[PDB]
Amino acid sequence: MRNDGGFLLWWDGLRSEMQPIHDSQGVFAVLEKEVRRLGFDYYAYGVRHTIPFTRPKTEVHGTYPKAWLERYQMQNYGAVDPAILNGLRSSEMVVWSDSLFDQSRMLWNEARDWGLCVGATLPIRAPNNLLSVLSVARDQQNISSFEREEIRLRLRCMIELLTQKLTDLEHPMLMSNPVCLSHREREILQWTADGKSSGEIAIILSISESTVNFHHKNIQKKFDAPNKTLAAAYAAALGLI
Amino acid sequence: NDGGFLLWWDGLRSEMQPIHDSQGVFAVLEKEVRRLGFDYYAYGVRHTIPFTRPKTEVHGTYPKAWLERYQMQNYGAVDPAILNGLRSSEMVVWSDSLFDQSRMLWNEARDWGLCVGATLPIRAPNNLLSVLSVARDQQNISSFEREEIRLRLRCMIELLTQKLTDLEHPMLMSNPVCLSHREREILQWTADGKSSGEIAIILSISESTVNFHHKNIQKKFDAPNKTLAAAYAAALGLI
Amino acid sequence: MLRLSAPGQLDDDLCLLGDVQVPVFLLRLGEASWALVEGGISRDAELVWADLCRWVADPSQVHYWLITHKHYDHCGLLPYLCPRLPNVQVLASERTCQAWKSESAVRVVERLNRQLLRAEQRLPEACAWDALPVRAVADGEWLELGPRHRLQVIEAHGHSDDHVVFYDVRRRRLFCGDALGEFDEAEGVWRPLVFDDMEAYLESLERLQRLPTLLQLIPGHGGLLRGRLAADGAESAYTECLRLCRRLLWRQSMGESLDELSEELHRAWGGQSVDFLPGELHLGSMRRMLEILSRQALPLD
Amino acid sequence: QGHMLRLSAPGQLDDDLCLLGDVQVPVFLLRLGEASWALVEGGISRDAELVWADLCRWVADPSQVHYWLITHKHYDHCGLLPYLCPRLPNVQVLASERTCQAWKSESAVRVVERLNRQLLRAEQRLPEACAWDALPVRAVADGEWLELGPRHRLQVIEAHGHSDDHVVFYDVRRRRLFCGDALGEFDEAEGVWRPLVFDDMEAYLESLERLQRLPTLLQLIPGHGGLLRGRLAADGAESAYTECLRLCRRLLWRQSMGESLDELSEELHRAWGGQSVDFLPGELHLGSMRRMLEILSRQALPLD
Ligand SMILES: O=C(CCCOc1cccc(Br)c1)N[C@H]1CCSC1=O
Ligand SMILES: O=C(CCCOc1cccc(Br)c1)N[C@H]1CCSC1=O
Ligand SMILES: [Fe+3]
Ligand SMILES: [Fe+3]
Ligand SMILES: [Fe+3]
Ligand SMILES: [Fe+3]
């Protein structure tokens, strides 16, 4: 490599620097290096899962002050954090601003207290219905427009490549829930999530209804689910069907 | 002073913001595609349901006859270029290996001159799978231009999905169902595995009320039971 | 090498005809279709037709002639060669054709072209200006010249109030004329050539930076550039233009006159264009460019 | 004060700053308080008796000089320390740990002493000098805040590239940057920067990159030429970056034609050396040109 002679050069150099990495810590280290090269002090990477629908897990990892992590998770500020929630509605980056935080005043005041006074956040959705987010933050310099655009591009590239590499390394933060369905069980669930009953599936797949209900039981067992509705809903939310 | 590519990005944005009609958006897309060196392009939206027969709508500039053929044989179901997006966010350069699973489609596309091309996927913020393809006939994708292209296509499709959502295109539109906070929270609880009685307990209402609410929800989806409602709501990002 | 600099074929399709100083470019659109670019001068016609004979078997198959702008060193062959390629459409911007319709502009061009003949050369046959086979083109127009030649026109005002450039999207090849400047053969950097408007010059370089990464960059003087030189061509030209701006502003803040830097620039640069540009016009053009820059440059505090 | 864009005369420069000695190799004086002062840049040896004179015009007591800031180790930015520190009892020298340790390394200080002994005026009489390892030094680190005075809070910033130890000082209250040689030698005749890359180009460019990010500058003070202001000082870092890449382009082109390093070194010397004849033997200037061209040919991105 990442250097000077053009944007494409920095892109290819970053890729080549990240290819040999077989340890997640080094991936995050390269990311931090480039973030500081951009001009900011801290960064963060968050993953919002879709379930549980009432309290969807939002896992986080970054380089904000550890005390701020303690406070953030203690009071579960991660649930209704505007920087993360913008990604559910938009593919555009969000520059931190008082107007954006009008709904969550306590969080913004505490973050300002910890030095996170200026920053930005970019969302992108993984091909498995996950909401990944990349935030950068500094203390004293406001984001000018031209630098806003520069950031948007560089952060997009960085987060895309980061999620790619973390999927290739099977990080626990992204692993969500390791569930594999067999071809038969997956198609049975496809039919069930389309509204078919045990008998209609038995007819269509040319198998018995007892077999179909036992497949349902296995599927439930994998999802740790009490009925078919939870299995179907979580499978639809996870992109398994 | 931060990359000459930034200039192209700024120019494209400035060109596409003042447009309030989708036809011009697609026209600008064609302009940039041809400026890169390709002949035709395409933009596809794969919905998540029906899970067995998922809707695949498309808009682009391929010969109309090949469109007739494509929909006639429902190639949108098992198109490898589109299905790549279900598991990866990386660009796909057209290659025999990619099409080994669906040779008929690739053979016919080659017959129509679509011999070289690429396809880039992206996930809209509403669980829809949008994809952008470019194609030409005689020149293989060289290495350096492959990456340059990849980046440009990513930017273009991001801004395209944004602007078409801002323009409320029908192809991006999904099944129109609106729920209130109470029924939405009831469905959140049901999709978490709770029974009628447990939901009634938690919300401090009666179980008859909760099952009547279930009927309310089912009526909108044209659904036969609660499982279909929960699955379609999860797939649509409503809960 | 990194620079190509010779009459004859450039690559699998194109040829440079005549003088590399005032070259004319030849596109092979097909088995039996050809096109031209740049109108050159009178003085190299006698080199044109002959060197052309080494590549084209029949002159009648030239169908297009592209002209960047109205300067004498990129336009002056219309009396010489146009009459004998009868199926040709000249394609040019409204500005350029209109300049060709005014007697004053053609007189300036004719005098400046006459200044460059040898005391031995005789003039070949000549035709009129308003009889030319002309068709107006627009910014961004798509020229389906050939099956593998789809080129776009791009308005690049600044060097002149009419300059335009041509981008081959298939080969990522840009004919830029003078909109980037005069390539310094001894140093490898760009010499700004702002002879009408600086804001338009810089905005043109901006709009050109937006093209896909270039493989081949073809200015009006010096041949063809490849590799890095072609990729950051517009960026580097922009940078050198602003560098000259700062030099001029600094020198003026010390009390120096535009003559001070004009004479110095002539001394250090004019040697390159002595073959096709009278030295006094080089000094005058340096002064014109410095005047425009001093007019439109951003001041300091 | 003034309408001018460059202040290049001994005497007061701002409401707290003064330039002392020769404008070519200046020493800058900051008034931290009524009875507290600080110095910046170490200049050269042979100006010891000039600077001192100037210094005593402004300060009633040399004991009120409490801090002395040094950018790097090169002979031309530290040669006054051994001679004048004996007259400033209350002074702390502040330099980077690499620069601090250089003064301990016998060979380095010998190069310093030699090059600074070579720039005397016929019968110049050096005054007595103390040891290089006897200086009252405190090492500073990247990003440290130097609480020099109540209204003087300067940050240290690592600016490697010009040398393996170079650092610069940012007075954030006045948006003033003491940048030494990390941007280069300002061309007084043309108004552009002459790159001075004498250790590593990647680090030099990364440092200029980082300095571009600072708040818009109002005052830019390199090690040679005085103080720059206005729009000349605002885009100074970007301009240095640009000129360095321009020289890279020049070198790479000349080598693609088959030229040697020494040829372009001689050309650059012809066109530049005239400025630094007073405080730099021409042969060392030519050698530095050759060294910079070496580094550029090594680390510059090829064209293929
Ligand atoms: O960047 C985000 C989203 C991810 C937050 O990640 C965090 C939060 C706390 C500790 C750690 Br470590 C990471 N939110 C912003 C809102 C303003 S402060 C902040 O963290
Ligand atoms: O791009 C796609 C998906 C369909 C988008 O293209 C189309 C299809 C139908 C009508 C229109 Br208009 C454009 N598939 C690729 C696979 C290789 S050839 C091809 O078109
Ligand atoms: Fe011209
Ligand atoms: Fe010309
Ligand atoms: Fe130095
Ligand atoms: Fe120095």
In the numeric block, which tokens belong to residue A211?
């077999």
In the numeric block, which tokens belong to residue C225?
């550039």
Domain boundary among B175, B191, B210: B175
Query: Which protein residue's CA is at the shortest distance from atom 7 of ligand 2?
Result: B42
Domain match, A205 and A104 both: no
Q: At what angle do helices A228-238 and B181-191 cross, to 10 degrees?
A: 100
Which of B1, B12, B123 to mutate to probe the A interface, most A CBs <10 Å?
Answer: B123
State residue C240 phi and psi, 5-degree precision: -70, -35
* D50/B110 Cα distance (integer angstroms): 84
3-class secondary-structure state, position A45? strand
* D179/D168 Cα distance (integer angstroms): 5
Return the half-sphere exposure (C-beta side, CA atoms, 13 A cut-off) of residue C61: 16
Structurally, chain A folds into a number of domains equal to: 2
Q: Which of B136, B82, B95 is nearest to B112 (CA)?
A: B136
Contact D48, D84 (CB under 8 A): yes
In chain C, what are the domain boundaries? 1-301
Q: Is B10 in contact with A90 (Cβ distance < 8 A)?
A: no
Residue A21: C-alpha distances to residues A16, A18, A29, B42 (Å): 10, 6, 11, 35
Contact C48, C81 (CB under 8 A): yes
Domain match, B83 and B185 both: no
Domain match, A161 and A206 both: no
* C195/D243 Cα distance (integer angstroms): 25
Computed over its alpha carbons, how large is the radius of gyration of chain A?
22
* C174/C25 Cα distance (integer angstroms): 12
3-class secondary-structure state, position B213? helix
Domain boundary among A128, A161, A177: A177
Q: Are strands B129-136 and B116-123 parallel, antiparallel or unpaired?
A: antiparallel
Burial annotation A102-111 (CB, 10 A radius, 16+ → b, else e): eebeebbeeb
Q: Which long-range contacts (CB under 8 A, 24 or more apart) does D253-260 make?
A: D253/C2, D253/C187, D253/C188, D253/C189, D253/C229, D254/C187, D254/C188, D255/D297, D256/C1, D256/C2, D256/C3, D256/C188, D256/D303
Task: Give, for A157, the enclosing helix (H) or strand (E).
Answer: helix A145-169
Contact D228, D5 (CB under 8 A): yes
C-alpha torsion sign, points A184, A190, A193, A196: negative
Residue D246: C-alpha distances to residues C187, C189, D187, D194, D269 (Å): 10, 8, 15, 10, 17
Q: Which atom of ligand 1 is nearest to the CA of A96?
A: 17
* C249/C242 Cα distance (integer angstroms): 10
Compute the residue count for chain C. 301
* C126/C45 Cα distance (integer angstroms): 11
Task: Give, for A197, the enclosing helix (H) or strand (E).
Answer: none
Residue type, C55: W
In the numeric block, which tokens belong to residue B118?
């690429």
C-alpha torsion sign, points B33, B38, B41, B46: negative
* B74/A48 Cα distance (integer angstroms): 35
In the numeric block, which tokens belong to residue C254?
């010390």
Spell out which residues of chain C touch residue A6, defining contact as CB-CB under 8 Å: 231-232
Query: Which protein residue's CA is at the shortest distance from atom 15 of ligand 2?
Result: B81
Terminal alpha carbon distance of chain A: 41
Query: Which protein residue's CA is at the shortest distance from atom 12 of ligand 2?
Result: B60
Q: Which residue of B has its CA nearest to D242?
A: B1
Contact A96, A121 (CB under 8 A): yes
Residue type, D147: E
| Strands lying side by side in the sheet with C164-168 | C3-4, C224-226, C216-219, C173-177, C164-168, C149-155, C142-146
Query: Which protein residue's CA is at the shortest distance from atom 6 of ligand 2?
Result: B42
Residue type, B222: D
Burial annotation D194-230 (CB, 10 A radius, 16+ → b, else e): bbbbbbbbebbbbbbbbbbebeebbbbbbbbbbbbbb
Angle at A37 between CA A23 and CA D217, to 5 degrees: 165
Q: Which residue of A has its CA nearest to B50?
A: A194
Contact D39, D27 (CB under 8 A): yes
Residue type, C250: W
Q: Any residues with CB less than 8 A from the CB of C67 and at least 6 apart, and which?
A: C38, C39, C74, C75, C90, C91, C92, C96
In the numeric block, which tokens belong to residue A219?
């599927």
Contact B40, B114 (CB under 8 A): yes
Question: For residue A53, is it left (φ>0), alpha (ψ between -120 and 50) or beta?
Answer: alpha
The structure was resolved to a resolution in Å of: 3.1
3-state SS, one letter per residue, for chain D: CCCCCEECCCEECCCCEEEECCCCCCEEEEEEECCEEEEECCCCHHHHHHHHHHHHHHCCCHHHEEEEECCCCCHHHCCCHHHHHHHCCCCEEEEEHHHHHHCCCHHHHHHHHHHHHCCCCCCCCCCCCCCCCCCCEEEECCCCEEEEECCEEEEEEECCCCCCCCEEEEECCCCEEEEECCCCEECCCCCCEECCCCCCHHHHHHHHHHHHCCCCCCEEEECCCCEEEHHHHHCHHHHHHHHHHHHHHHHHHHHHCCCCHHHHHHHHHHHHHHHHCCCCCHHHHHHHHHHHHHHHHHHCCCCC
3-class secondary-structure state, position B147? helix
* Residue A220 CB neighbours (<10 A): 16
* D186/A11 Cα distance (integer angstroms): 33
Residue D48: C-alpha distances to residues D25, D52, D55, D92, D221 (Å): 11, 6, 10, 18, 21
Domain match, B97 and B107 both: yes
Instruction: Please tell me whether D181 is known to bind a ligand.
Output: yes
Domain boundary among B144, B159, B175: B175
Q: Is D191 in contact with C247 (Cβ distance < 8 A)?
A: yes
Spell out which residues of chain D touch residue B1, defining contact as CB-CB under 8 Å: 238, 241-242
Pocket of ligand 2 (CB under 6 A): B 42, 44, 58-60, 62, 67, 70, 79, 81-82, 109, 114, 119, 133
* D185/C249 Cα distance (integer angstroms): 19
Q: Which of residues 134-153 of C touch B (CB under 8 A)?
A: 140, 142, 148, 150, 152
**Which residue shows structure tokens 């001068």?**
C41
Torsion angle of C-alpha atoms A51, A54, A60, A65, degrees rounded to 10: 180
In the numeric block, which tokens belong to residue A198?
């045990």
* A128/A105 Cα distance (integer angstroms): 32
State residue C26 phi and psi, 5-degree precision: -120, 120
The DSSP secondary structure of chain C, one letter per residue, reads --EE--SEE-SSSEEEES-SSS-EEEEEEETTEEEEE----STTHHHHHHHHHTT-S-GGGEEEEE---S-GGGTTTHHHHGGG-TT-EEEEEHHHHHHHHSHHHHHHHHHHHHTT--SSPPPPP---STTS-EEEE-TT-EEEEETTEEEEEEE-TTSSTT-EEEEETTTTEEEEETSS-EE-TTT--EE---SS-HHHHHHHHHHHHTSSPPSEEEESSS-EEETHHHHTHHHHHHHHHHHHHHHHHHHHHTT--HHHHHHHHHHHHGGGGTTTS-HHHHHHHHHHHHHHHHHHS----
Domain match, A139 and A42 both: yes
| Strands lying side by side in the sheet with D6-7 | D6-7, D227-229, D219-222, D176-180, D167-171, D152-158, D145-149
* D276/D286 Cα distance (integer angstroms): 11
Q: Any residues with CB less than 8 A from the CB of D42 and at least 6 apart, and which?
A: D27, D68, D70, D77, D78, D79, D80, D81
Residue B99: C-alpha distances to residues B107, B144, D74, D254 (Å): 9, 24, 65, 49
In the numeric block, which tokens belong to residue D287?
């050698």
* D225/D183 Cα distance (integer angstroms): 12
* Residue B225 CB neighbours (<10 A): 16
Q: Which of A200, A204, A209 is nearest to B228 (CA)?
A: A200
Domain match, B166 and B226 both: no
Instruction: Please tell me whether D165 is known to bind a ligand.
Output: no
Give strand pairing partners of D204: none
3-class secondary-structure state, position B116? strand
Q: Which of D155, D292, D173 is nearest to D211 (CA)?
A: D155
* A238/A179 Cα distance (integer angstroms): 10
**Which residue shows structure tokens 């998922």?**
B54
* B129/B46 Cα distance (integer angstroms): 5
Return the half-sphere exposure (C-beta side, CA atoms, 13 A cut-off) of residue B221: 27
* D127/B234 Cα distance (integer angstroms): 85
**Which residue shows structure tokens 């200006």?**
C129
Domain match, B107 and B134 both: yes
Contact C27, C145 (CB under 8 A): yes
**Which residue shows structure tokens 């990522």?**
C172
CA of D185 to the centre of ligand 5 (A): 9
3-class secondary-structure state, position A43? strand
* B46/B126 Cα distance (integer angstroms): 12
Q: How many CB pairs under 8 A join B and D?
A: 3
Tell me the residue range of the domain where B96 lies.
Answer: 1-175
Return the half-sphere exposure (C-beta side, CA atoms, 13 A cut-off) of residue D170: 19
* C244/A15 Cα distance (integer angstroms): 37
Task: Give, for A131, the enclosing helix (H) or strand (E).
Answer: strand A131-138
Contact C235, C211 (CB under 8 A): no
In the numeric block, which tokens belong to residue A77?
């500020």
Torsion angle of C-alpha atoms C43, C46, C50, C52, degrees rounded to 10: 40
Longest Cα separation, chain B: 69
Domain match, A24 and A63 both: yes
Q: Any residues with CB less than 8 A from the CB of C100 and at least 6 apart, and which?
A: C70, C75, C78, C92, C106, C129, C130, C132, C134
Compute the residue count for chain A. 241
Q: Which of B163, B145, B142 is nearest to B18 (CA)?
A: B163
C-alpha torsion sign, points B2, B5, B9, B10: positive
Bond from prior residue into C79 cis (ω within 30 degrees of 0):
no
Residue A173: C-alpha distances to residues A121, A235, B26, B192 (Å): 19, 19, 39, 21
Query: Which protein residue's CA is at the shortest distance from atom 18 of ligand 2?
Result: B109
Contact B190, B230 (CB under 8 A): yes
Exposed (0-12), middle (13-18) or buried (19+): which is A36, by Cβ within 10 Å?
A: middle
Report DSSP state, residue B218: H
Give strand pairing partners of B116: B136
Instruction: Please tell me whether D22 is known to bind a ligand.
Output: no
Instruction: Please tell me whether C162 is known to bind a ligand.
Output: no
3-class secondary-structure state, position A120? strand
Bond from prior residue into D82 cis (ω within 30 degrees of 0):
no
Domain match, B15 and B66 both: yes
Solved how?
X-ray
Compute the residue count for chain D. 304
State residue A101 phi and psi, 5-degree precision: -95, 15
* D220/D236 Cα distance (integer angstroms): 8
Report DSSP state, residue A87: G
Which of A4, A33, A36 to mutate to probe the D interface, most D CBs <10 Å?
Answer: A4
**Which residue shows structure tokens 């002209």?**
C67
Residue type, A76: N
Q: Any residues with CB less than 8 A from the CB of B155 and at least 6 apart, and which?
A: A153, B9, B12
Contact D157, D143 (CB under 8 A): yes
3-class secondary-structure state, position A147? helix
| C12 and B CB contact within 8 Å | no
Q: Is A241 in contact with B51 (Cβ distance < 8 A)?
A: yes
Q: Which of D158, D159, D143, D142 is nearest to D241 (CA)?
A: D159
Exposed (0-12), middle (13-18) or buried (19+): which is B41, by Cβ within 10 Å?
A: buried
Domain match, B44 and B149 both: yes
* B115/B108 Cα distance (integer angstroms): 10
Domain match, A158 and A227 both: no
**Which residue shows structure tokens 């640009």?**
D242
Residue B1: C-alpha distances to residues A13, B235, C190, D242 (Å): 19, 43, 18, 9
Domain match, A100 and A213 both: no
